[PDB]
Every structure is written in C-alpha cells, then in structure tokens.
Amino acid sequence: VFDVGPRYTNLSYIGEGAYGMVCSAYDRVAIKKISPFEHQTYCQRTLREIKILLRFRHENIIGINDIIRAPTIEQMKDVYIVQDLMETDLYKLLKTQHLSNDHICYFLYQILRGLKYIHSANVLHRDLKPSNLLLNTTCDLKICDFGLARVADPDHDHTGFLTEYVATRWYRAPEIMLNSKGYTKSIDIWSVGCILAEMLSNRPIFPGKHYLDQLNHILGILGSPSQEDLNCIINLKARNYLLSLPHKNKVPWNRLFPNADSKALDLLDKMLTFNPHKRIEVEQALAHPYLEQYYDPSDEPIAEAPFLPKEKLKELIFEETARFQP
C-alpha cells in the first residue's frame, strides 16, 4: 500500500530496508513509507530524521520536500517522506566501478562540505557509510539517513568497555568499543576515513565479522596504540585489554593502497587516527592539501544556529509534520 495522491503518481520500486520502502513518483521524486508507531525506538528515529532534515538546508544534505500523513493523530499510522530523487548510492557504485582519484577527491570534498554544515549545527550523523551517500550522473553527492543522529554532547561521551552500539559495524571508530558513546564529532570523521579507504580499493577497510572483531581489524592496521594514547583511554578494562595484546606494528598506508595519491593517504592517516582527540576535525580536513583544488571556506556554509513514551513521540511527529498539511 503506497497512498500518496493526489500530488504523486506512477510509482516504481527503488529499494527496501528496516525503515520501510522507497519508490520513485511523479510530482520525479523519491518517496519513502515509514510505519514506526508501534515502537518507541522507531518513533525516535523517525522524529530525528524529520526534525533535523527540516532544519537543514544544504546542497550536500538530502532535503525533505514534503511529508504525507493522516489529518489526525488517531488516523495516522504511516508517514511518507518525499525527497529529491537521485540515481544511485556510493555502495552500489563501488560494486560496479573503480573510481579515479579525481572522482574520489570530489566525492570526499562533498562529504566533508556537508559534514561541516552538520557539525556546525552541533549535530552528529553517526551512521556515515557508502549506502547513505546518494549520487547522480553530474556527480552531486547528498548525505542521507539521520535516524541515528544526535546533538553532540562531549561532556557525556563516556561509557564502559565493550558497550553495545547501534550504528553500522564496519564504520565504527575504535573508541566505540573502548570508552565512547559516539557523542562527539570525531565519531563521524572516523567513518569518513573508512569511506575514503573504501573508495580507494572498492573494499571495506575494516570488515569486522562481529563486535570485538571490529577492534581486531582496526588494531591490525593501525598497530598498537602509543603510551600517550593509552593514557587517554579512561577505562580500567580498556587499558588492561590493550596492555594485554602483543605489540603490533602499523601497516603502511602505501602497502594497503599502492596506487593511491600520496596526499589522499596523508589525509586518510589523519582521519583514521586512533586517539579521537588527535583526529583531524572537519574544517581541517577540508583545508588538507588533497582537497586544495576545491577548498573555499566562503562556499562551505554553516548552519544559522546550533541545535519519552511512543505515544508522546507520535504527538511530536504529528506536530513536526503539520506544516505540510493543506
């Protein structure tokens, strides 16, 4: 059932996921059907997607063009979110094409330009990965899926060793497994570093097969953390775990990526820094020599200002979508 008229017609299936289903429709646009009201978690992800995307306006962030839902809270069971139609995503593109360096450079620039705007609003995306980067034939790139987004909260980032996490395994920073809830901007930079590595070789750089295996993959390439980085680890159990490991040397980036541009690998190194406090921030990344041909702070805008039971969340979703009613 895809009930979006009178405005949208001639539907065609694009894809499907845990969120629901997305189609293309003539206003052509993309339309996704969300049916989240039976569970608090799904309502939280829906309200985050909507509240954040309605408050953002940026060329490298997917917008929300329209939202269709019933005229009353009682009748509202589904929500249809209308967005600009794109042609593919970076996950699909990487299955069929090896990207030239100059495409990687331009795509990375756009990811970081959009991320600058997100981080300037004090928001964290928290699930950056190739499938959340939409592309078209003109090589425009848009960041999508803010369902796991949060307002940054560095003062409350601390958690225990081996604390469960929801965002996509392969793109998780090492500190998620050691001491962090993913409430600081550095979590997104790590994910971008993973995406860069993936564009350079068409394979995920750290394909952990399960939770702790993800840290095995990271330490297998970065090598053992330094004493100073262990001094920043916070948790007794994380310190003891890292101290218990045999010494592992760093695998050189030029051995993993022998055909990559040296400036791309220097930036990769800085995004894939073990210690989040030493990891490059988005504005620094934009200013890195690899991206020098595109860097222009005057054309990298920032946000105008920074940023419960399932029944209360439904009321909030109802209120947040009210502006699209005739």
Catalytic residues: 127
Residue closer to ligand G67 (CB basis): 25 or 178: 25
* Three-class secondary structure of residue 291 per DSSP: helix
Q: Which residues of 65-85 are buried (b: 16+ CB within 10 A; e: fewer)?
A: ebbbbeeeeeeeebbbbbbbb
18 is in an annotated binding site: yes
Position 187, amino acid: I
Residue closer to ligand G67 (CB basis): 127 or 300: 127
Q: Give min distance, CB of 243 to ligand G67, in A.
A: 38
Distance CA 245, CA 1 (A): 54
21 is in an annotated binding site: yes
Distance CA 114, CA 112 (A): 5
192 is in an annotated binding site: no
Position 259, amino acid: N
16 is in an annotated binding site: yes
Residue nearest to ligand G67 (CB): 147
Residue ranges binding ligand G67 (CB under 6 A) = 14-15, 18-19, 22, 30, 32, 34, 36, 42, 45-46, 49, 62, 81, 83-89, 92, 131-132, 134, 144-145, 147
Q: Give min distance, CB of 67 to ligand G67, in A.
A: 11
Neighbouring C-beta atoms of residue 159, cutoff 10 Å: 19
32 is in an annotated binding site: yes
C-alpha distance from residue 176 to each of 127, 150, 285 (Å): 13, 15, 22
Distance CA 145, CA 166 (A): 14
Q: Give min distance, CB of 126 to ligand G67, in A.
A: 11
Residue closer to ligand G67 (CB basis): 93 or 238: 93
C-alpha distance from residue 130 to each of 81, 134, 260, 294 (Å): 21, 8, 19, 21
Q: Give min distance, CB of 193 to ligand G67, in A.
A: 20
Residue closer to ligand G67 (CB basis): 24 or 235: 24
Residues flagged as binding site for ATP: 14-22, 32
